[PDB]
Amino acid sequence: PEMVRGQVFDVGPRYTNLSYIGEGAYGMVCSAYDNLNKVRVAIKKISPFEHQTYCQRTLREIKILLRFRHENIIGINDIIRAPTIEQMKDVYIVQDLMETDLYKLLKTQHLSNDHICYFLYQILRGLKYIHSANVLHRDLKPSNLLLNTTCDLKICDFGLARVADPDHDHTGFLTEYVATRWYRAPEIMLNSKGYTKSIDIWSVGCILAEMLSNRPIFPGKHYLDQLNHILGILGSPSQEDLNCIINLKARNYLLSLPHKNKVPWNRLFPNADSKALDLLDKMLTFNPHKRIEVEQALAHPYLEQYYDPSDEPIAEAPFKFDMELDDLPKEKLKELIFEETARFQP
Numbered sequence: 001p002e003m004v005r006g007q008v009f010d011v012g013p014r015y016t017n018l019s020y021i022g023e024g025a026y027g028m029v030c031s032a033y034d035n036l037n038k039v040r041v042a043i044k045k046i047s048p049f050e051h052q053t054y055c056q057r058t059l060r061e062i063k064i065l066l067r068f069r070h071e072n073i074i075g076i077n078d079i080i081r082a083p084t085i086e087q088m089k090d091v092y093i094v095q096d097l098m099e100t101d102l103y104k105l106l107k108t109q110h111l112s113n114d115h116i117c118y119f120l121y122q123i124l125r126g127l128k129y130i131h132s133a134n135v136l137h138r139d140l141k142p143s144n145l146l147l148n149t150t151c152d153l154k155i156c157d158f159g160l161a162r163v164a165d166p167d168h169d170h171t172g173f174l175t176e177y178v179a180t181r182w183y184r185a186p187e188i189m190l191n192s193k194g195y196t197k198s199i200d201i202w203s204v205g206c207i208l209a210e211m212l213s214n215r216p217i218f219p220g221k222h223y224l225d226q227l228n229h230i231l232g233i234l235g236s237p238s239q240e241d242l243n244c245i246i247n248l249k250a251r252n253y254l255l256s257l258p259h260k261n262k263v264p265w266n267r268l269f270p271n272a273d274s275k276a277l278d279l280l281d282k283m284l285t286f287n288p289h290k291r292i293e294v295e296q297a298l299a300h301p302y303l304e305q306y307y308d309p310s311d312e313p314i315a316e317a318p319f320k321f322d323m324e325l326d327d328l329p330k331e332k333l334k335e336l337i338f339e340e341t342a343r344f345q346p
């Protein structure tokens with residue numbers, strides 16, 4: 001059985017020639033060759049069954065990605081696991097192969113205003129579909145945006161994604177410490193169980209900033225420092241913004257802080273399209289409720305060249321509260337992961 005950096009990839013005879021691409025908390029992703037379809041693929045190995053959060057994440061990533069069909073979202077071509085539940089210790093998710101990620105590209109390359117323009121368009125096109133399906137991504141960042149040779153873009157890694165049916169009040173039930181620090185909306189710190197899909201718009205904000213500078217905008221070294229970096233540029237929240245913070249303990253924490261002034265965008269990004277900076281501002285708005293939503297952001301002037309509602313599919317079938325009940329023991333999540341991967345067994 002082929003191995004990559006001390007990691008066994010039991011992908012039978014069909015898939016061969018494994019190269020490393022990257023890793024995550026509970027597995028590794030490789031490039032491979034499908035001998036059946038004569039095409040190169042990506043294979044993400046997952047080993048989650050020891051820890052309950054990993055099984056919950058694995059089940060969502062698979063259910064969500066299996067219903068999604070969109071040109072700016074990575075899909076699932078195939079899934080491999082043992083013939084019986086007792087033997088299943090690993091799940092292999094076969095996905096389409098991309099050439100690079102936006103993280104890698106920004107190390108080697110300063111992007112034309114046209115490239116930034118077109119990348120941002122694609123991120124929001126796919127985000128439109130994600131949000132349309134009552135899903136939050138919750139870890140948008142450059143290394144979860146894939147690119148190929150023809151400048152086509154795909155959102156990947158739905159490990160931290162989940163359904164929030166907008167017909168239920170989820171304030172108090174959402175997981176606490178989501179997103180990657182530098183891309184973390186302020187309300188994840190101040191309202192850590194009450195946030196919304198608007199946290200994805202924040203993340204896109206930070207990505208746009210990073211595309212204009214080749215430098216991350218809010219590089220906090222630790223949890224409460226991140227909030228300082230944000231406040232460092234946006235300036236202290238207005239009274240109206242502290243009025244929209246329902247959590248008294250966090251309202252007080254903010255009042256306690258020394259007044260900081262807003263740093264205008266054009267001093268941070270002197271060479272940058274004024275329309276880019278207008279959208280950057282509406283995305284990096286402190287108050288989640290005032291923050292630009294995904295449709296309004298596609299409709300912004302900066303993206304008028306690409307914006308067309310008739311070519312921006314939404315989900316035929318949005319996810320509803322019934323497909324959220326996954327607060328269950330890990331042995332029962334294992335059985336649910338078994339059932340969902342069945343459609344790919346002989």
Ligand SMILES: Cc1cnc(Nc2ccc(F)cc2Cl)nc1-c1c[nH]c(C(=O)N[C@H](CO)c2cccc(Cl)c2)c1
Pocket residue numbers: 021022023024025026027028029031042044045046074095096097098099100101104143146156157158159
């Ligand atoms: C699906 C896919 C398809 N093509 C490529 N191409 C690629 C991407 C980045 C590179 F540096 C080089 C290459 Cl060739 N990458 C991917 C890909 C990159 N990351 C992921 C992906 O899902 N990565 C996440 C890490 O956040 C992951 C991976 C393994 C286990 C876990 Cl638990 C999590 C898929």
